[PDB]
Amino acid sequence: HTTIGDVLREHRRSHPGRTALVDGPVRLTWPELDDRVNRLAGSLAASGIGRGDRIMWLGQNSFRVYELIAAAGKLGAMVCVGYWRWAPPEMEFALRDFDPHLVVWQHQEIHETVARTREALGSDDTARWLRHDSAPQDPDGYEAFLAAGGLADPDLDIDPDSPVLVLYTAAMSGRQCGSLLSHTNLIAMATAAAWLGDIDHTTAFLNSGPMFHIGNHQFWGMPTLLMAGKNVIVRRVVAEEVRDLLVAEECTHAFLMPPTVAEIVRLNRDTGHDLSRLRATVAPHLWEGMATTDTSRFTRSGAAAGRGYGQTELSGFAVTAAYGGPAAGNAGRPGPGLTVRVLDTAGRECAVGEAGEICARGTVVHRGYWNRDEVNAHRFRSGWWHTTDLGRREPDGSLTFLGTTTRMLKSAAENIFPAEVENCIEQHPAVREAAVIGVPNTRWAQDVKAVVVLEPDAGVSEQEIIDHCRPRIASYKKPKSVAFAAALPRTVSGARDYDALDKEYGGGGYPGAATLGPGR
Amino acid sequence: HTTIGDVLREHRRSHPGRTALVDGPVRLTWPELDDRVNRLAGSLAASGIGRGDRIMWLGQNSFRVYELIAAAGKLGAMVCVGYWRWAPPEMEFALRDFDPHLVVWQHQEIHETVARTREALGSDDTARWLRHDSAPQDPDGYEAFLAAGGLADPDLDIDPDSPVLVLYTAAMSGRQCGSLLSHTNLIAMATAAAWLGDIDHTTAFLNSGPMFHIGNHQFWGMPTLLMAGKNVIVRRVVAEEVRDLLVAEECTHAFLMPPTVAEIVRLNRDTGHDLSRLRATVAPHLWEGMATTDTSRFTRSGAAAGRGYGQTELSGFAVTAAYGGPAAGNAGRPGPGLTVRVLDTAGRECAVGEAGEICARGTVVHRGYWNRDEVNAHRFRSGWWHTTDLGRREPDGSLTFLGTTTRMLKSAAENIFPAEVENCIEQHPAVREAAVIGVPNTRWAQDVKAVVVLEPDAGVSEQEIIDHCRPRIASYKKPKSVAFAAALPRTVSGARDYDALDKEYGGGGYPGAATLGPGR
């Protein structure tokens, strides 16, 4: 069975002259990339990394993320792409939970957060640390570490069901879980995406989405890699730099949400820079004729506007309106390599039209979460992965995604789980309880809002509650407003009544049948 | 991991009212098909079929072949789709070699061959035999056997690497070998084909190629099944019926090799039906402008003219000009899920430009042949599948298929090995020795020719040698001409000097650098 390592082994032979990666001045053909991967694998193995061992990336997007995944993959090891946006306590939690043998970290932009995180681990910090964006000769730097390795391919027999990429998600408990994506997961996801988006060796994809998110890997980093196209890296999304890279690298695809598109168009207008090679998937109307609207099924089906269903744990958008033709349901049908059933609370399959939990089996279902044996045993019960999302089958057999069962928010293209924010706010000594909801954002999706019950005789303002979150959770997770109450609404059972909180405090816009996709 | 049974389980839910299969008056929706498959699996299991057990189909194309593959697949058993064109000695050999628990047979057009074969087996005939084209109530019939089974899905956990389809090929020794194709083999083949041919739920594919050969399954039976298109069955190519089905069922594709096309075209000039919906991939010029020339990657690239490389043992056409763009080499490059190396006789990879044996690893490599321990250990040596075909890598990274190492002929895409034909001819009492070569034929690529040395003072004509072959080997393998000679030129080691035979008797048209594809 094919592994990620085999993809690079074949491309170095079949596409010796083609450029595989561009990241600033760095440009690598398939053979140059595979050589670097082999040296890197050499040094990892010399550091004691082998099957089932673990590397953490703490940085923005880099070509080195692809090198590390491939190198680790050739050893049967796995790479966690941590989020550069995480606050120190989140980064510390991920480091302790994942327990990596190696941490590859970035100084630019996040040095302070990285330092505070390392400091906090104290003597529990057993990992080796390499700075990726170091001076070339830095002996604790990635490039020197890589250079010391030998050119030979490790040539190991790696089982492609081995986890190779780990993406933290699913923080419904207040703490994130690391989704284990195997070589086979990624290859099956990439294969389906190649049909969905008509990807081939001429594809040139700008990696302008966060590598912490499954979306950038699915659309279209991994299919581009699989088909031997060019992956162009950008560290962060800055409209001008994106525009220049679209032109300079003749990109055919990019991961760009509607606000960024509008910034690029405004900036490019009447400058004569030709963006016509770009196949616009998201908000194609905003490009004003500067791009070519994508003709692939991804865009024509409505999948690019949110007509589909998935999650990290299914290797991304695994159900779409592109599979199986016209769909009465909002999400369409499963791609090949996944089967789906909507199950009631007793684990019996729901009838047509009846809401239940979306469950799945097949090649794109992940291996489970890192270090969560009981969660895995429970969410895989009866041999089906339980998504925690609600859906139904329509009479035409298509699927409708109705909403979450976890009160998850989406805000500014991030997921926010209420318990992460609630736990943070409740750490405050003045706060007895906090409930977090989402309210409609003026453009798309939600803003975070907290409803707070103060301790008796304590007093703290809305702004103090918000600012309290700054050192503790990612910036995008903070409430944008806070309401105060003497008590939170309760159901008959004494559970928090989140429906009543939404009704009384302006909640709405949650992911589901009324709010699908990236917006406009 | 996804299995063949999962495809049916998913389509019964996702496409409740869509037609999956058409065969004469039989029309089955996805749920109707899966129900029948479940009853069939029940009856198979009740007769003692389980994991690793074997069913032989000895019939022409039928909807029941798909039913049997899926039902066997749900039990972890396997189906051999035998050649209905086999002569009795070949059919007998395959039955003894394959040793099936159950044989499903057809009366129409082949009853005499089947009866002769069964007689030859005598008391070695241990299998149960079911007539598929029986009267409905026939208790030795497929329909009554199926109807006794229950509707419950067996819901067994089947390993996708289990063989599920067995196709006889590779008769270099003079006797065929059963290539073991798994669920995973077929699913990877089909996913790649859907990309190659732009296959989707609107595909209506006429199964006019013999299901005993990998061609019909790859192009496009399995991808059509996988993407929930409609599979229309015809038992074999009868020109008038093919014409009628293309029209009535609004077919978009069909497996029609060059010799079949002109008569279909001729008969449609009488009717004036528009065949524009048919996307002709093979020899589109022969359609005289009635069909549309397919514009999928498969046809635009030249792959549909033979620019590719593969074999049944690689799940079909695994290397093609559609993978990876323009290619100096005649075969293009490997599809995803296959890695290819050209190896020298010592097992070292060949330099660029150096001829060697094409060897392969990956998801589309078969599980080996049935009951061929020694051949399998040799052909899988050093962890690569050895194809026996010669090729080389070009400087641009692409692959060239140079030719066979077995003197094999290939006529309208059917392999014909000289030993098969030579051995049959030499059984004639008047024949002392025979050598078989191929001669060019534009429409068939090449024709079988025999060069025969008669026994002294015995006599036999060309026609007589040809007719001698009819009871002994499949029709398509017979010589189309016989030359008589006083002696065969010999090599130093005593083998036939085939190069001298080709030069003397107009030999050519062999598959490889000089002739690709099925004809024109």
Ligand SMILES: C[C@@]12CCC[C@@](C)(C(=O)OP(=O)(O)OC[C@H]3O[C@@H](n4cnc5c(N)ncnc54)[C@H](O)[C@@H]3O)[C@H]1C[C@@H](O)[C@]13C[C@H]4C[C@H](O[C@@]4(C)C1)[C@@H]23
């Ligand atoms: C990010 C994705 C690609 C990866 C999967 C997915 C669902 C994702 O968010 O993965 P996630 O981060 O793991 O979140 C999964 C959770 O997200 C929810 N969800 C499930 N389906 C949807 C839906 N259709 N719209 C909104 N929300 C959805 C469910 O609660 C699910 O459990 C989509 C959302 C989709 O909207 C877009 C936005 C952009 C980018 C990418 O391509 C797009 C043009 C479409 C694509």
Ligand SMILES: C[C@@]12CCC[C@@](C)(C(=O)OP(=O)(O)OC[C@H]3O[C@@H](n4cnc5c(N)ncnc54)[C@H](O)[C@@H]3O)[C@H]1C[C@@H](O)[C@]13C[C@H]4C[C@H](O[C@@]4(C)C1)[C@@H]23
């Ligand atoms: C049948 C196939 C599809 C399945 C694989 C293959 C190779 C097959 O027949 O498998 P097989 O019966 O197992 O035979 C394998 C042997 O066939 C030889 N071979 C390998 N590659 C080629 C070649 N390019 N042209 C001619 N012969 C070839 C090699 O000696 C090899 O070992 C091709 C032949 C190819 O010609 C065509 C004909 C039609 C239909 C289908 O699409 C086509 C437009 C192309 C396609």
Ligand code: NA
């Ligand atoms: Na508190």
Ligand code: NA
């Ligand atoms: Na003889």
